[PDB]
Amino acid sequence: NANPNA
Amino acid sequence: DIQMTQSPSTLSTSVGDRVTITCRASQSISNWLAWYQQKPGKAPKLLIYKASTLESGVPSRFSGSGSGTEFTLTISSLQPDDFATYYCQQYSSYWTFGQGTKLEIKRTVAAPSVFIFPPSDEQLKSGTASVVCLLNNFYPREAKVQWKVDNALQSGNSQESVTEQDSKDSTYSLSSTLTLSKADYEKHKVYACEVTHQGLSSPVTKSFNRGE
Amino acid sequence: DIQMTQSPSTLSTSVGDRVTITCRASQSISNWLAWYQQKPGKAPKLLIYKASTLESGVPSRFSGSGSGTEFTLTISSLQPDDFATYYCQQYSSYWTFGQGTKLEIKRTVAAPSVFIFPPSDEQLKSGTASVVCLLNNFYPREAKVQWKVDNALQSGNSQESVTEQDSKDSTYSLSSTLTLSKADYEKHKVYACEVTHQGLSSPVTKSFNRGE
Amino acid sequence: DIQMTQSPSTLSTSVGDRVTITCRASQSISNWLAWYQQKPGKAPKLLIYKASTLESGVPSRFSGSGSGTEFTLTISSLQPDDFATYYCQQYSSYWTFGQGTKLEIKRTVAAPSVFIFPPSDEQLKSGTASVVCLLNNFYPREAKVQWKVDNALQSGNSQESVTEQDSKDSTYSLSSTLTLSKADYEKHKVYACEVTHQGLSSPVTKSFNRGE
Amino acid sequence: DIQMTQSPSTLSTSVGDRVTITCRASQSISNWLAWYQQKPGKAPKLLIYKASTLESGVPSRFSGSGSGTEFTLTISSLQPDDFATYYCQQYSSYWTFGQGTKLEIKRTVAAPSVFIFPPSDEQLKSGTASVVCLLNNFYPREAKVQWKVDNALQSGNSQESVTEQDSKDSTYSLSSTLTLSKADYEKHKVYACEVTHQGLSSPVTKSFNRGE
Amino acid sequence: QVQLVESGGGVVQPGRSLRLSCAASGFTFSNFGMHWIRQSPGKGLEWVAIIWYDGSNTYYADSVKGRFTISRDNSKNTLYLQMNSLRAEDTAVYYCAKVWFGESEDNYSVDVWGQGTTVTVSSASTKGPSVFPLAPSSKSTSGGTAALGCLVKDYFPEPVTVSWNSGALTSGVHTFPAVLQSSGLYSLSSVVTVPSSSLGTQTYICNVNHKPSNTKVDKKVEPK
Amino acid sequence: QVQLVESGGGVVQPGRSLRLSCAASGFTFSNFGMHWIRQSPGKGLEWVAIIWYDGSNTYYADSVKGRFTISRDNSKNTLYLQMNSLRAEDTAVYYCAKVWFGESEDNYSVDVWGQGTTVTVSSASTKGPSVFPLAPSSKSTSGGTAALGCLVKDYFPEPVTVSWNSGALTSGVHTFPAVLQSSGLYSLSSVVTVPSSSLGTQTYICNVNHKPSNTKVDKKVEPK
Amino acid sequence: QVQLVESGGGVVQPGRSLRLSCAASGFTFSNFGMHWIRQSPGKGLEWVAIIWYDGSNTYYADSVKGRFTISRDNSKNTLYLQMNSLRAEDTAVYYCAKVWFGESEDNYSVDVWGQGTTVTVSSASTKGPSVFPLAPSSKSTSGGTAALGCLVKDYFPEPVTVSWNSGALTSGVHTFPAVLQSSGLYSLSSVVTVPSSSLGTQTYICNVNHKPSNTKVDKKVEPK
Amino acid sequence: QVQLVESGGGVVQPGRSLRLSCAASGFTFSNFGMHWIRQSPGKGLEWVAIIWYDGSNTYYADSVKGRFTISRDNSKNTLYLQMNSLRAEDTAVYYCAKVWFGESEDNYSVDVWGQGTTVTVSSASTKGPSVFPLAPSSKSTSGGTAALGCLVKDYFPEPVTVSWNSGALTSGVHTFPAVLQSSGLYSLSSVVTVPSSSLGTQTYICNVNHKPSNTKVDKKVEPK
Amino acid sequence: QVQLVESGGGVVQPGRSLRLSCAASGFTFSNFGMHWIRQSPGKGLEWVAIIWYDGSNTYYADSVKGRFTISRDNSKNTLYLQMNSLRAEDTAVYYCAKVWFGESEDNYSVDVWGQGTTVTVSSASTKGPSVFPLAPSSKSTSGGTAALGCLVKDYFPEPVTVSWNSGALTSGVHTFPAVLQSSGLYSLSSVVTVPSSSLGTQTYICNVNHKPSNTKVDKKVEPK
C-alpha cells in the first residue's frame, strides 16, 4: 500500500 | 490476514448524544486506520484517515483517536444526518474491514402487534404451504419468534425478515415465513407462532386450525 | 519450596460476625503475603498484599495482620457478599498458595431426609448396577454414609458428591453411588445405606431387597 | 501515589540571607528528586536534578542535599533575581510535585490603611449588593477581616483577593467583597469590616449606614 | 557470522513416534528462526518461521518452540512422508543454516552380507588396481571396514560410499574402494577387507590371493 | 465534482465470465490508482483488488487471486475488471473507488466511492412471481384495525416493485426486504393496516411488477 | 477496566500438545509482566509460569519446567502458553494474571485474574451418556414428600445440562456436581422432591443435553 | 536555544473535547520524550502524561487515564494532547516539557518547559462585565490621601484589562486578581489612591476592556 | 502455484565467468526480493546473496563478496547471478528463492525455493569412463545368492547412467553415489544379487551411458 | 578494500564557511552510518558529528552544535560537512569514518577512518618566509663536530619544504616541526652536524620551497 498516485 | 472487530454492533442513540465507538485490530496497525460512513441504499463516505485526521467537509463534531490496536470514534453531539453505519478499516497491510456499527434511533419501548396469515388455497393447490407471522410497529428490534405445530417446536423450516427503521417513527416490522410441503402441512392440525419482545410482559401466541 | 497452610479449612459463621482466618508458612517469608478471595464459579480477586495493605476498592471491613511466618485475615463485620473462599499466597520465593478457607453460612441444625434408589433392570441388562443413596437438606455438611450388603460393609466401590449451599435455605444434599457388576449384585439380597449425622440422635438405615 | 510536602510554605527573607527549604516524600525515593524555580506569570525553570547536581547555567549559589525521604535546597546568598517559587519533584515513581515554597521579601512591619466602599446605586438597581473593604500597604500578609452587619458576624458570603508584593515597596493590598441580595442588604442598617493585623494594637473597624 | 548447531545429527525413529530436534545459535537471535524441510534429491520446503508460526499448508503435527539461543522442532506423531532432513536457519543477522538433522527409518537389526572383488586384468593392464569390498543390507548405518594387505593396515588410500535407505526394506549398502598402482599392487600377495558391525559378535574377513 | 459510473453487473451462471467497467469523471483519472471493493450481507465489506495509476502494479485478495484481472484505459479514463471462474459467493455490490492524495511515505486508501453495481452469481433461470393474497378476517383483526397483504413468491431475478391500488394507497404500507430461498428464487411480502370497518366494502388490489420479464399483475385481495 | 480473556482450552489426549492464549485489554499490556496460574480440585491453586514485560526473563514451576513454554506478543497484546508432553495431572482451569504495579525494590504478585479456561487431559473418547431413572416408590416416600431423579452415567467430556419437564419444574431440583470414575467417564445424578399426592398424575421427564456429542435424551420417570 | 510554544487553549463547555498542540524548535524534537504538565490553583503542579521519543510507550496520570490521548508528529515536530470528556477540575495552565538527556540507567524528568496555555472548563456563557463605581468620601480619606476604584463584577471569560484615565493615572493603582464566584462568573476590583484635595474637581474614569466580547466601558466614579 | 526455474549451470574452468538465470512464475516477480543460496556436501546450506525488489540494496556473503553480482529484470521476470573468478570451493547446487510476505518491521527470509542448478568448478577435462567387471566367484557367494557388478572409474564430469540388461534387471540393483577422487575424476560401483544357480548360464551386461560425451559401453561380467 | 578520500580542505578566514566532502568506495556506502571526527594538538581526538545511513537522525558535539551541518548524498556515495562561522579553535585534521557492522542492540562506533584533511582557521595573509643562516663558528664547535642550520621564519600558510643541496645531503639533517606564532605566521628550524674539517670548503645551501606561493629560496650558510 504505497503511493499509487503520480 | 488482519482481523478487525468493531464494538458495539448496534448502538441505540438520540440526537445530541455523545457517542463513542471502538475498533480493534488483530495485530498492530500503527496509526493506519480510516473511518468510513455509509447510509443505507447509498454509497460509503470517508470520514477520518490516519486514525485522527478529519476529512475535508466533515463537521468538527466528529473526532478520531487511538493507535496500535485500539481506536475510538467520538461524536460530540449527534445530529439526524449522522444516523448511518460506520466502518473502521486498517490500511497498514492490504485492507480489511470490520463488521460495522449501526447507529440506531433510540425511542421509547413499543410492543409489537402480532398477526398470523394462513397459506392461500392456490399455493396449497400448488403443493406448498407458507404461513406468515407479522410483528408490526415494535421497538427495540430484538424479538424471538418460535413456530409450534401441534405443540412441537419447529427448527430449520422458517425464515425471518426485518425492515429498517421507519423514517416517520423509527419502528421495526418483522415477517416470519414457515414453509412446508402440502403433505407435511396437511399432516397436522394446529399452527402457531409465539412471539417474545422486551415490550411484552407475556409471550403472544397466534394460531389457526388447518381448514378453519 | 515454601509450604503454606491455612486454618481453619472450613469456618461456619453468620452475618455480622467477626471472622479471623490464619495462614502459616514453612519458612520466614517476611511480609510478602497476599490474600485472594474467590467466589464459586468465578475468578479470584485480590484483597490484600504486603500482608496488611488494602487493595484499592476493597471495603474497610477487611484487614490483614501478621509478619514472619504467621499471618491473619480479619473481617470486622461479615456481610453476605463476603461468603467465599479465601486463599493466602506467599510471594517471597516463587509463588505458592494455601489450600483455602471456605466461609460457610451458619444456621440451625437440620437432619437429612434419606432416600434410596435401586438399580434399574435396564442398567442391569446393560451390565452395570448403580445404587443411589440421597441425603436431602441437612446441616452441617459433615455426615457419614456406610453401605451394607447383607450386613457387610463395603469399601472402595462407592463415590460421593455434594452440592453447594442452597441459595434459599443454605442446606446441603449428598449423593452416594455404589457401582457393581451384575454378578456381584445378584449374589446378594439386602442393600442398605446407613447414615449418621450430628443432627440425628440415632443412626438412620434405609434398605431394600433385590428384586422386591 | 507518592505524596510530597515542602516546608516552609512561605519564607520571608532578605537579600544576602542564607535560605534553606526542605522537602519530604511519603516514601523512599532514593535520590531521584528535582528542584524547579518559577517566577510569577512565567514558566518554571529547572534548577537541580539528582537532588544535588547543579544544572548547567545555574549560578553556584544554589545547592541541593538530601537522600531517601528528606531533601533540602540551599541558597548561600540570596539575590533579587532569586525571589520566586520553588517546587520539588520526585521522579522515582511517576511524577509528583510539592505544593511549592514562595520566597518573600522581608521588610519592617507596616500597619494597613483601611477603606470601605458601599454598593453603587446601579448595582442595587441590578438586584445585588457588594460591599468592599480594602487593606492597603500592609506587611506581613497575615490579617483577618470579619464582616459585621448590625453587629452580626457574617460567614460564607464573602470572598477575599490579595495582590502580589508591590515591586516598589514590597507591600500588599487586599480586597474583601461581601455579596448579599438586595432584600438582605435593605433589611439591615450598619455594615462594618473589622481588621486585625500584627502592626495594630487593637482591631480597626470601618462602617457605614445604608442610605447615609 | 552467527554459528548454528543442530542436535542430533541423525535420529532413528518410527511412524507414530514423537520427535524432538534441537537447534542452538552462537548468540541470541530473539525469535527470528525458521525451519526448512528437505527431502533427498529435492528442493527444501519451508515449514516454520518466527520459530513458532506454521506455514500455510503444513500439517498441525509440526510445532516450533524456543527463544534466545535454544529452539526446538517437535513432530507430535510421525508419518512416513516426514522422513527427511530438517534444517534450522537464523535470520536475525544475515542468514546461516544448521548442519541439518536427518530422520532415519528405524527397523530391526540386520547383519551385513560381505563380498570382495579383486581388480580385473583389464584394469591391471591399464595401470591401476581397484579392490572393492561390499556390505549389503545392514542396519544401523555405523560400520567399520578395514583394508589389510598381508596383514598390514592401509590408511589414506581408500574411499567409501553409502546408499540411501532402501524404499522397500530400509537397509543400507556400502562400497569401499581401495586404489593402488599396478606396481604397489603386485608387490604383495594377500588382500583382505575386515568388517565390524554392532550386529556382529566377531569381525568378518574376506580375502583373496593376488593372481587367484 | 467527482463522479463514478459502474456498469456491466447482472445475473451470471457459475463458471462463466463477466467484465465490469467504471467510468470516472471530475478528476484526472490517469493520475490515481483505483480499488474494487465488494459488499455482501454475508461477508460485509470486502476489498477485492487495487491497481496503480499507470497500471504498473496490481494486487488482489487471496480469495480472488488468479481469477480476477483489473486493468485500465487511461486514454479513455475507464477502469475494467475481468472476472473469470465466478463462484456463488461472489454475489455482491461492487464499487470502484479512488485513492486519496497523500504524502510520499504515507499509506494510502480510498476517499471517493462509486455508485455501485450489483452482481448476482446464480444458476437460477428467469421466472415470474406468484402473487398470493393475504386476506384479512377476524383472525387478522385486533380492535378496529385489520391487516392484509400480498405474498410475492418465487421470482428471479431481483428486483420487483409492489404498489397498492395503482399507487393510490401508500399510508401504512410495509414492504419487507426480499429473502433468498434454497431454490435460488426470491420472495417477499407487502402488508398494510386498514380500518376493520372497511373490510368487505373497500377494494384492495396489489400491483406487482417485474421489469426483467415485463410482468404486471394486479391481484385483488378479498376478505374471508 | 482491566479485562483478560483466555481461550484455547479443551480436551487433549496425554502426550499431545496444546496452546493457550490470553487476550488483554483495558491497559498497556506491554508494560506488565504476566503469570499463568492453574487450579485443580486436587492441588488447589498452583502457579505455573511468569514472564517479564519484554520476555527477557521467564520462570516455571518445577512440576512443569521443560514441558511448558510461556511467551507473549506485545504487538497483538496476547499472552501464550505452549504446553507439550501433557500428563493426566495437568487437567485444571488455567488463568492468566497481571502483575500489579509497585515499587522498584518490592516483591511482586498478581492483582487481576482472567476469566479462566478449562483444560482436560484424558485418553477417553467422546461418548454420550446413559440415562437411567431413579424411580420413586413407597421406599422413597416420607409423609407427603417423595424423591425421584435421573442418573447420568458414563459420558465424556464435561459438561452436561439437565432440565426437568422442559424447564417448567425448577423448584426443589438438585443436580449434583459430576464425579470422575476409575474408567475415566463422568457420572452424576439429578434429583427432585415432589408431593407424593402428585405421583401417577403429574408427568416427570428429565431432559439431558450434551452438546459435545449432540446428545438429547428425554427420560420419563415412572413410580413403582 | 530550546523553545516550546503551546497553542489550542481556550474556553470549552464541560463534556466537550479540545486538542492542544506544542511546537518545538531549537533541537532535534524526534530524539526526546515529552511531558504534558498542568498547573492549577487548587492542586498546584500536577503531571498529566508522558510519551516516548517514538510514541511506543505512553503513560498517564490516574485522574486523566482513559480520557486524554497524547500523541506526536515527529515529521512536524509537534506534540499533541487530545482531551475528551473534560471535567470542571481540568481547568488549568498546560505546559509541554522536554525530557533532559541523561544516562541509560537513570530515571528521567523534564528540564525545559513550554510557555503554557490556559484551559478553562466552564458552562458559563460569554458575558460582558458590569462596572460599578467605588465612590470615595470622608469615610475613605486618611489625611491628604483618598481611595476610589471600580468593581468589575460578573464577566466571563477571562481576561479583562483595567486602566485609569486612559493610562494617565498609574501611581497607586492596585488591580486585584480575579476571583471565580459560585455562579461561574469572575469578579475583581481595581483601586487607586489620589490626593484628597483633588476630589470633586479632578475627573477619574476607569476603562474596562474585554476583548472576547469586544466590551469597552469608561465608568466615571463620582463621590456621594 | 509458485514456480522457479534455474538455468545456466554446468562445468566451468577456474578463473572463467558464468551467468545463472532464474525464471519466475505464479506471482508478481517485481514485487518481491530474492535470494541466491547454495548447498554443498562440505558446507551444507549456505546463503550467497540477496537483492531488493527494486535492486536498490544488495548483500553478499563474505566468502563471495566482491566476486558475485546479483541483478534482476522485472520486465522479463528474470533473476540473474553473474559469478566471476570462480574457485574450486564454489562447486554447489544453487537455488533461487523468494522472500516471504510479512510485516513492515519483521525480519525476512525465504519461503519458496527454486528447483536448483548444479555448478561444478574444476580444471578437469571431459572424459569418458572405464567400465570394469566385478566378476562373481566362490569368494563372492553366500548360499544361493551371489553378487556381481560393474566398476565405473575415472570419468568427468557427472553424471553417468548405469542399467542392467537394457533395463530388464532391476531387482536387487544397488548403484552407489559417485565419489570424487584426488584426480578430479569420479568413480562408482553398481552391484546386483542373483541366484547362484544361474551363474555361468545367465548373461549379465551393464550398460553405462554418458550423454555429454556420447559414451555407450556394454560390459559383460563373466565368472572366474 | 574500504577506501575513504577527503577533499575540500584549505585556508579559510575566520567567520567564513567551508564544505568538506568524503568519497567512499569499496563497500555499499548507503548501508552504513558515518562519523566526522577531528584531531588537533590542543584537544586530541574529538568527535564532531554522526549521521544515520538514511540521514534521518544526526548528532553533533556540544562545541559545534548550531554551526556545523552534516549531510550525505547516497546517490553519489558522498558525505558532506558544511561548516559555518568557523572559529580559530576549529583548526584541526578532520577524518570521515565508517561505523562498524554489529548487532541490532549493540552500541556503535567507527572501524575504518579516512585519510584526513587539514583545516586551518587563521586571519593571517599568505606570506613567503624569511630564511636566515645559523652560521657555525668557534662558538658552535666542540671537537671535530660543528652545527649549522637555516631558520625559516614568518611564513603563512603551511606547509614548507626544506632540502639541502637539492636533496643530495640528507644524512644528519633534523628539520623541526613548525610552530605557529602570535602573528599567525609559522616558523621552523633545520639543523645539521658536519665535520669541522670540512668548513670553508664544502658548500652547504638550504633550499626552502613553498608551492602555495611558488616561493623558492636557496640560502648559502657560510661560517664566521
Q: What is the second-level CATH architecture of the domain J130-220?
A: Sandwich (2.60)
CATH number for the segment(s) I130-221: 2.60.40.10
* Other C-beta atoms lying within 10 Å of the C-beta of residue H202: 11
β-pairing, D10-13 vs D101-105, is parallel
* Other C-beta atoms lying within 10 Å of the C-beta of residue F167: 8
Query: Which class in CATH covers the domain with range D113-209?
Result: mainly beta
Q: Please give the Cα distance from E115 to C66 (Å, whole number).
A: 84
Q: Please give the Cα distance from G78 to G96 (Å, whole number).
A: 11
DSSP E36: E
Q: Do chains A and H touch (3 or more CB pairs under 8 A)?
A: no
CB H120 within 8 Å of CB H212:
no
CB H34 within 8 Å of CB H42:
no
Q: Please give the Cα distance from D61 to D71 (Å, whole number).
A: 17
Q: Is B31 part of the contact surface with chain F (CB cutoff 8 Å)?
A: no
* Other C-beta atoms lying within 10 Å of the C-beta of residue H28: 14
Angle in degrees, CA F121, F127, F132, rounded to 5: 125
Q: Please give the Cα distance from F81 to F18 (Å, whole number).
A: 8
β-pairing, G78-83 vs G68-73, is antiparallel
Map grid coordinates 556436501 to a residue: I41
Q: F191: helix, coil or strand? A: strand
Q: Is D54 part of the contact surface with chain H (CB cutoff 8 Å)?
A: no
Span between the terminal Cα atoms of chain C, in Å: 58
Q: Please give the Cα distance from C74 to C61 (Å, whole number).
A: 8
Q: Please give the Cα distance from D81 to D21 (Å, whole number).
A: 17
β-pairing, I92-99 vs I78-83, is unpaired
Give domain limits for chain C. 4-105, 113-209
CB I82 within 8 Å of CB I102:
no
Q: Say which amino acid occupies D113.
A: S
Buried b (16+ CB within 10 A) or exposed e, G32-68: bbbbbbbbeeeebbbbbbbbebebeebebbeebeeeb
Q: Do chains A and G touch (3 or more CB pairs under 8 A)?
A: no
Q: Which set of grid coordinates corresponds to residue D14?
A: 532578605
Interface contact G104-D93, CB threshold 8 A:
yes
CATH 2.60.40.10 boundaries in chain J: 3-121, 130-220
Q: Please give the Cα distance from I85 to C53 (Å, whole number).
A: 75
Residue J146 β-bridge partners:
J141, J194
Q: How far is C160 from chain G (nearest CA, A)?
A: 8
CATH 2.60.40.10 boundaries in chain G: 3-121, 130-221
Contacts of C46 in chain G (CB under 8 A): 100, 110-113
Neighbouring chains of E at 3+ CB pairs under 8 Å are G, I, J
CB B58 within 8 Å of CB B111:
no
Burial class (CB in 10 A: 0-12, 13-18, 19+), I170: exposed
User: Which technique was used to obtain these atomic coordinates?
Assistant: cryo-EM
Q: Do chains J and H touch (3 or more CB pairs under 8 A)?
A: yes
Q: Please give the Cα distance from D205 to G89 (Å, whole number).
A: 88
Q: Which set of grid coordinates corresponds to residue F133?
A: 393474497
Buried b (16+ CB within 10 A) or exposed e, H185-201: bbbbbbbbbbebeebee
Buried b (16+ CB within 10 A) or exposed e, F5-26: ebebbebbeeeeebebbbbbee
Considering only CB atoms, H17 lies closest to which of B63, B66, B67, namely B63
CB B164 within 8 Å of CB B105:
no
* Residue D152, CA distances (Å) to B173, C192, D128, D155, D183 in order: 71, 92, 20, 10, 16
Q: Which set of grid coordinates corresponds to residue J114?
A: 579516512
Residues of I with CB under 8 A from a CB of J: 57-59
CB E191 within 8 Å of CB E139:
no
Of J148, J56, J47, nearest to J92 by C-alpha is J47
Neighbouring chains of D at 3+ CB pairs under 8 Å are G, H
Contacts of I100 in chain B (CB under 8 A): none
Considering only CB atoms, H69 lies closest to which of B18, B65, B76, namely B65
Q: Please give the Cα distance from E135 to B184 (Å, whole number).
A: 78
Query: Which class in CATH covers the domain with range G3-121?
Result: mainly beta
Q: Is B3 part of the contact surface with chain G (CB cutoff 8 Å)?
A: no
Contacts of G115 in chain C (CB under 8 A): 43
Contacts of A1 in chain B (CB under 8 A): 32, 91-95
Residue J195 β-bridge partners:
J145
Residue J14 β-bridge partners:
none
Neighbouring chains of G at 3+ CB pairs under 8 Å are B, C, D, E, H
Neighbouring chains of B at 3+ CB pairs under 8 Å are A, F, G, H, I
Of H148, H150, H151, H131, nearest to H140 by C-alpha is H148
Q: Is the peptide bond before F14 cis (omega within 30 degrees of 0)?
A: no
Q: Which set of grid coordinates corresponds to residue I143?
A: 548360499
* Residue D102, CA distances (Å) to D84, D142, D144, H93 in order: 6, 15, 21, 19
User: In chain G, which residue's Cα lies nearest the Cα of B70?
Assistant: G25
Q: Say which amino acid occupies G105.
A: E
Q: Please give the Cα distance from D179 to D131 (Å, whole number).
A: 7
DSSP G176: P
β-pairing, J78-83 vs H3-7, is unpaired
Q: Is G54 part of the contact surface with chain C (CB cutoff 8 Å)?
A: no
Burial class (CB in 10 A: 0-12, 13-18, 19+), C148: middle
Q: Please give the Cα distance from J209 to J191 (Å, whole number).
A: 17
Alpha helices in chain D (DSSP H): 121-126, 182-186
Q: Do chains F and D touch (3 or more CB pairs under 8 A)?
A: no
Q: Please give the Cα distance from H187 to H156 (Å, whole number).
A: 9
Contacts of B91 in chain A (CB under 8 A): 1
Alpha helices in C7-65 (DSSP H): none
Interface contact I45-E44, CB threshold 8 A:
yes
Size of interface E-J (CB pairs under 8 A): 4
Contacts of B70 in chain G (CB under 8 A): 25
DSSP E26: S
Q: Which set of grid coordinates corresponds to residue B206?
A: 397466534
Rg (CA), chain A: 5
Q: Please give the Cα distance from J207 to F116 (Å, whole number).
A: 92
Q: Please give the Cα distance from G171 to G191 (Å, whole number).
A: 11
Residue H15 sits at φ, ψ, to 5 deg, of 95, -15
Q: Is G71 part of the contact surface with chain E (CB cutoff 8 Å)?
A: yes
Q: Please give the Cα distance from C50 to C59 (Å, whole number).
A: 17
Q: Please give the Cα distance from H200 to H221 (Å, whole number).
A: 10
Contacts (Cβ under 8 Å, ≥6 apart) of H204: H148, H164, H165, H169, H192, H194, H220, H221
CB I103 within 8 Å of CB B93:
yes
Q: How far is E48 from chain J (nearest CA, A)?
A: 23
Of B118, G176, I145, nearest to C166 by C-alpha is G176
Size of interface I-J (CB pairs under 8 A): 5
Interface of B with G in 69-88 (CB under 8 A): 69-70
Q: Please give the Cα distance from J159 to B86 (Å, whole number).
A: 76
Q: Please give the Cα distance from F46 to F94 (Å, whole number).
A: 10
Q: Which set of grid coordinates corresponds to residue I12?
A: 566451468
Q: Which set of grid coordinates corresponds to residue J142?
A: 666542540
Q: Please, what sign has the CA dihedral across residues C144, C145, C149, C155?
A: negative
Contacts (Cβ under 8 Å, ≥6 apart) of G138: none
Q: How far is I110 from chain E (nearest CA, A)?
A: 8
Q: Please give the Cα distance from I217 to E156 (Å, whole number).
A: 31
Q: Please give the Cα distance from I34 to I54 (Å, whole number).
A: 10
CB B37 within 8 Å of CB B23:
no
**In terms of residues, how long is chain D?**
212
Q: What is the second-level CATH architecture of the domain E4-105?
A: Sandwich (2.60)
Q: Which set of grid coordinates corresponds to residue I24?
A: 519466475
Q: Which set of grid coordinates corresponds to residue A3?
A: 503511493
CB D52 within 8 Å of CB D74:
no
DSSP J87: -
